[PDB]
Amino acid sequence: GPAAVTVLGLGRMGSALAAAFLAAGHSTTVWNRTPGKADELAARGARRAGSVAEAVAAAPLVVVCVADDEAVHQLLDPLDGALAGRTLVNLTTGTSAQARANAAWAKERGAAFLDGAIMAVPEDIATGDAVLLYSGPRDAFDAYEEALRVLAPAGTTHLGGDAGLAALHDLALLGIMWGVLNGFLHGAALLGTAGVRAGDFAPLAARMTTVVAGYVTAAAPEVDAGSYPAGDATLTVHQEAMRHLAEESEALGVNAELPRFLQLLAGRAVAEGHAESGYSALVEQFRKA
Amino acid sequence: GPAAVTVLGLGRMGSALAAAFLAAGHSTTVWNRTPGKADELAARGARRAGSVAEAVAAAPLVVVCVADDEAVHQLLDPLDGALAGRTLVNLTTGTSAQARANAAWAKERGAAFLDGAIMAVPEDIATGDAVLLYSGPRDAFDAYEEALRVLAPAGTTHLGGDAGLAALHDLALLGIMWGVLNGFLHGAALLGTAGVRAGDFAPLAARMTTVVAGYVTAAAPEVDAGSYPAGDATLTVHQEAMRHLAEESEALGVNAELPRFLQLLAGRAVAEGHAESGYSALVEQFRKA
Ligand SMILES: NC(=O)c1ccc[n+]([C@@H]2O[C@H](COP(=O)([O-])OP(=O)(O)OC[C@H]3O[C@@H](n4cnc5c(N)ncnc54)[C@H](OP(=O)(O)O)[C@@H]3O)[C@@H](O)[C@H]2O)c1
Ligand SMILES: NC(=O)c1ccc[n+]([C@@H]2O[C@H](COP(=O)([O-])OP(=O)(O)OC[C@H]3O[C@@H](n4cnc5c(N)ncnc54)[C@H](OP(=O)(O)O)[C@@H]3O)[C@@H](O)[C@H]2O)c1
């Protein structure tokens, strides 16, 4: 049947995690530092643990979702041997270095450790819009995927054994989001000088975004190969259009810092001999500090 | 019946335009500065004009596709009485300023003017994959829509009456492309430090991209209303994640200039008083030089 699970942390997001486990039929034990945040869950069937030690002893799967890594260790460091044989899933926001250090710490204490990144707001937990990324030993993920997937039934993803991968993928994916939104908003500013409503630009911008998803998968093998054929446009052609975008921005009185930055990066690739390479050659500029 | 059409310029793209008109059954007159580029078009029924003047006299719809605005200028400027009653469609890459000047110039010579932006490679002309954006007086677009759509049968769009709109839309849409691709390549660099192959990141990055296409249309009403509710994250929350991405880049030895620039832009918005606004508030600083 459903695995027993413990949730440590009943903030907005921890509470949503515990509610999802309970609604899916798991025996759910909950704990929070400050009393008074567990009684609705208890009334729905959760076990209100009397202490951290009881909570951690209650289930082989311990999901932690608190403010930061300092709080995680305030809760878990005083435990003496309680973690041995258990699987710790840390959904607290942290860095890749914190996750890798936590993996070593947990291994010393006999626990399996998965670091997770929640790509969702609390209200979207257990919906098809949620994504949760996991990293750490695959055997622990496989053992508990049936339980963990109730938090993101169409979005539960194991990335690999390096515990730092979740944090890094989360940030990398947000980078794509910021790139899209900046392009939309800068474009909306540019077109706004000609009276164009952002809602008139948006369907074209959204379709472009969808099209460029295919460019992403097309570029990946070139990155891995270190070989960057021009395909449909050399970096020279890209850079010229970048220059044009900057010059139109300056002429029309909107901010040109974004296209000038794009042009800077492309120019560094051209300076290293990639005038006739495809856009994927810019990966070499991103690897260099 | 299919309108007679003239194509000026038989480079890689002009040749594809002429071929498409011919295949669709239009009487097609062609001209190129250098002879010997129209043999196959002529075998297919193209009428080879001996001069620009003869070409413009042959058909009321004149499609121009040469290297740049200087070339368009050298072809058009000697024409006076020849242009009366014609509709000039300029598919040459150029600036919004040049397009607006060309519209006014043509109108004083008795000719209608549409500026166009080809978002396609030559081999995709006359396929469902092609996109062609047009701008200029709508009466001319409507008069020749049946002819023009042969070039992009599922992707022809008239943007508005301002002749400069096509150039601006093309560049704004490319800005979105560069945003996605830089986000992907920076992410690939960052994850590369952990041994992640770009092809293993790519499915996640592409899924992200297709999801964020929906964020674009969600943001448009906020831009048009000048109202920027936080939604799922205030600018403070965005900026903190941006800083995290920069710090991970720095600590892992890859380039951090992109996340630091993202941080700069978001901080520009926060300094205007938008700490608690949503991301669409960034449009305001994109409007400011
Ligand atoms: N949209 C989101 O909310 C979202 C999305 C993705 C990830 N996350 C992550 O989820 C984690 C929790 O966020 P949240 O929204 O639930 O935050 P929250 O509503 O502020 O709750 C924070 C939780 O951390 C606990 N905590 C703080 N300091 C502690 C300590 N020293 N010892 C023990 N517990 C401590 C709090 O306990 P008390 O009740 O005793 O204060 C509470 O359970 C964060 O790392 C957050 O970044 C949140
Ligand atoms: N993928 C693409 O190719 C693509 C995509 C979108 C837009 N475009 C745009 O389409 C336009 C043409 O590109 P293309 O690929 O066809 O370039 P191309 O193969 O280099 O052909 C350039 C054409 O311009 C003509 N030309 C140049 N200077 C001239 C002048 N001073 N007087 C008369 N004719 C002149 C050339 O005539 P000669 O043969 O006599 O040299 C030739 O017909 C450009 O503005 C380009 O940016 C191209």
Side-chain angles (χ1 to χ4, degrees), chain A residues 1-239 241-287 289, chain B residues 1-68 71-289:
Chain A
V5 63
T6 287
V7 176
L8 308 178
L10 298 176
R12 277 177 73 241
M13 168 78 69
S15 296
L17 308 180
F21 285 128
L22 198 56
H26 293 264
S27 163
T28 302
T29 301
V30 300
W31 195 77
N32 189 66
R33 163 183 73 166
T34 301
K37 311 202 184 177
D39 272 32
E40 297 208 302
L41 284 161
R44 270 232 298 131
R47 164 63 191 171
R48 178 181 61 239
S51 69
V52 177
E54 183 210 324
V56 169
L61 180 63
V62 179
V63 176
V64 182
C65 188
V66 290
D68 50 34
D69 198 57
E70 183 163 330
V72 169
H73 285 283
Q74 284 179 20
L75 294 182
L76 297 179
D77 287 357
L79 300 175
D80 197 322
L83 273 182
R86 294 172 202 289
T87 298
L88 186 52
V89 178
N90 192 11
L91 302 180
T92 304
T93 298
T95 71
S96 69
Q98 282 172 340
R100 290 158 168 171
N102 277 343
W105 168 87
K107 190 158 199 203
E108 265 155 22
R109 271 120 201 110
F113 178 79
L114 295 171
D115 200 61
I118 303 167
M119 284 209 89
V121 293
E123 319 97 85
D124 282 346
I125 295 287
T127 76
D129 282 344
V131 162
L132 267 76
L133 311 178
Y134 295 90
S135 48
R138 182 178 68 175
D139 283 339
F141 177 87
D142 289 347
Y144 291 106
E145 178 182 13
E146 313 103 82
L148 293 174
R149 77 181 297 132
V150 316
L151 309 174
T156 292
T157 306
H158 180 256
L159 300 164
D162 176 346
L165 293 175
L168 293 180
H169 278 79
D170 189 7
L171 292 170
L173 292 170
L174 295 175
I176 292 177
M177 189 203 48
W178 292 316
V180 172
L181 293 178
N182 284 353
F184 174 60
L185 293 172
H186 179 245
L190 181 72
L191 292 167
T193 70
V196 179
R197 291 297 191 191
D200 278 348
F201 175 47
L204 293 69
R207 184 181 187 270
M208 183 78 168
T209 303
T210 299
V211 169
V212 175
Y215 296 6
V216 166
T217 40
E222 305 175 336
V223 171
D224 287 325
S227 177
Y228 319 112
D232 290 341
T234 61
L235 274 174
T236 291
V237 165
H238 283 275
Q239 190 183 15
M242 283 192 185
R243 177 188 99 232
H244 187 188
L245 178 55
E247 278 165 5
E248 298 270 16
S249 297
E250 298 166 357
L252 298 172
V254 301
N255 191 271
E257 281 177 73
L258 170 54
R260 287 302 186 192
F261 178 73
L262 302 176
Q263 190 194 191
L264 181 68
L265 297 188
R268 309 215 291 226
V270 170
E272 295 199 311
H274 293 286
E276 293 290 287
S277 299
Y279 200 85
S280 296
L282 260 199
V283 73
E284 292 187 9
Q285 294 317 123
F286 288 117
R287 297 200 210 267
Chain B
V5 63
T6 282
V7 177
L8 308 181
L10 299 179
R12 298 201 38 251
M13 175 71 78
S15 294
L17 309 180
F21 285 124
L22 276 173
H26 294 259
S27 179
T28 303
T29 296
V30 299
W31 177 91
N32 195 63
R33 165 179 68 174
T34 302
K37 290 195 187 167
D39 293 4
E40 280 323 299
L41 293 167
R44 276 164 69 181
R47 292 160 226 221
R48 293 180 282 206
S51 65
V52 175
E54 295 173 280
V56 171
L61 180 64
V62 178
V63 182
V64 184
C65 188
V66 293
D68 41 41
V72 173
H73 190 243
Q74 291 171 15
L75 296 194
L76 295 191
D77 198 56
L79 306 170
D80 248 354
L83 290 170
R86 263 91 269 260
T87 294
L88 282 162
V89 180
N90 186 24
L91 301 186
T92 308
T93 303
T95 72
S96 69
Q98 308 167 341
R100 295 152 161 171
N102 286 346
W105 178 85
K107 163 167 189 335
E108 29 195 3
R109 268 131 207 100
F113 182 84
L114 292 172
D115 198 53
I118 302 169
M119 317 201 63
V121 295
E123 295 82 13
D124 278 357
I125 295 294
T127 76
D129 283 6
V131 167
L132 266 81
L133 313 174
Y134 297 88
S135 52
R138 197 177 55 175
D139 289 338
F141 176 85
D142 294 326
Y144 290 100
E145 193 188 1
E146 303 98 329
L148 293 176
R149 62 192 168 208
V150 311
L151 305 177
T156 295
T157 291
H158 180 257
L159 300 164
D162 180 342
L165 291 177
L168 297 177
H169 275 81
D170 179 24
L171 291 169
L173 292 168
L174 295 176
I176 293 175
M177 186 191 57
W178 292 316
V180 173
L181 289 181
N182 282 1
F184 171 64
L185 297 172
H186 181 244
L190 180 74
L191 296 168
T193 69
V196 179
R197 271 177 308 221
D200 284 330
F201 177 46
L204 287 83
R207 182 158 166 195
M208 203 44 200
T209 299
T210 58
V211 166
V212 177
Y215 297 7
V216 171
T217 44
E222 298 177 339
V223 175
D224 285 337
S227 177
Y228 319 115
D232 286 344
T234 62
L235 277 170
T236 300
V237 167
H238 282 277
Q239 201 174 3
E240 182 91 317
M242 274 181 194
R243 181 180 65 82
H244 183 176
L245 175 58
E247 277 161 14
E248 297 272 13
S249 297
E250 278 163 352
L252 292 177
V254 301
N255 194 271
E257 279 171 270
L258 171 53
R260 288 298 186 197
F261 181 70
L262 299 178
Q263 216 183 339
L264 174 157
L265 293 179
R268 262 167 70 82
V270 165
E272 292 170 347
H274 287 292
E276 306 304 322
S277 302
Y279 202 80
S280 304
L282 258 77
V283 70
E284 298 214 342
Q285 55 83 41
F286 280 127
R287 298 195 206 270
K288 296 190 182 83

